[PDB]
């Protein structure tokens, strides 16, 4: 529903101290998301080189601040999509630590 982001951004404490402008939720298994770290190595949006794009399309939800959104009254727009996800990976085991973008 259109309510998804409004509820999720809140419950995930992404509206606690600020209105987190954008946030993407991935509706795939953890294993499939973690596996992206072993896939197409691409440049992060900030230029860093430890980002990886998923070979296949994943089901995601994009949460975006509405124009009337202002802390402490946050408000979001829910957008469902099926895109390749790009994440920044690090550590041992090599797993995502940042969600870069979607293409």
């Amino acid at each position: 529903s259109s309510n998804y982001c409004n509820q999720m951004m809140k419950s995930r404490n992404l509206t606690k101290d600020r209105c987190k402008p954008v946030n993407t939720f991935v509706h795939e298994s953890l294993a499939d998301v973690q596996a992206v770290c072993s896939q197409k190595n691409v440049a992060c949006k900030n230029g860093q080189t430890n980002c990886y794009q998923s070979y296949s399309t994943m089901s995601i939800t994009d949460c975006r601040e509405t124009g009337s959104s202002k802390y402490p009254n946050c408000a979001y727009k829910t957008t469902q999509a099926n895109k390749h996800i790009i994440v920044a990976c690090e550590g041992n085991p090599y797993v995502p630590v940042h969600f870069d973008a979607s293409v």
Binding site: T24, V26, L30, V33, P96
Partner: peptide, 15 residues
Amino acid sequence: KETAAXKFEXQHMDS
């Protein structure tokens, strides 16, 4: 026990 890896799951995972 909170790590960058767990933080990612908290923020982005929703199976």
